[PDB]
């Protein structure tokens, strides 16, 4: 809601900063396999548990 708590605003903040794509300079590395970010999340489909 809009009446969050601190532990929850902070957990949503972490879940916001984990939600960005891999930097493009990172699959020009040598020992590399990650084609893209597969742990991504959309607010509509997957509902963050909670």
């Amino acid at each position: 809601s809009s009446h969050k708590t601190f532990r929850i605003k902070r957990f949503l903040a972490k879940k916001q900063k984990q939600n960005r794509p891999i930097p493009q300079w990172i699959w020009m590395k040598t020992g590399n396999k990650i084609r893209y970010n597969s742990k991504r999340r959309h607010w509509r489909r997957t509902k963050l548990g909670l």
Partner: peptide
């Protein structure tokens, strides 16, 4: 400098629904 594509996940649907509405009573 080769740019990249994208990817989005989605829950896997499981087929288990059974209405079983049809009834054929014949004693």
């Amino acid at each position: 400098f080769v740019f990249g594509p994208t990817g989005m996940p989605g829950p896997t649907p499981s087929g288990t629904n059974v209405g079983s509405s049809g009834r054929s009573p014949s004693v």
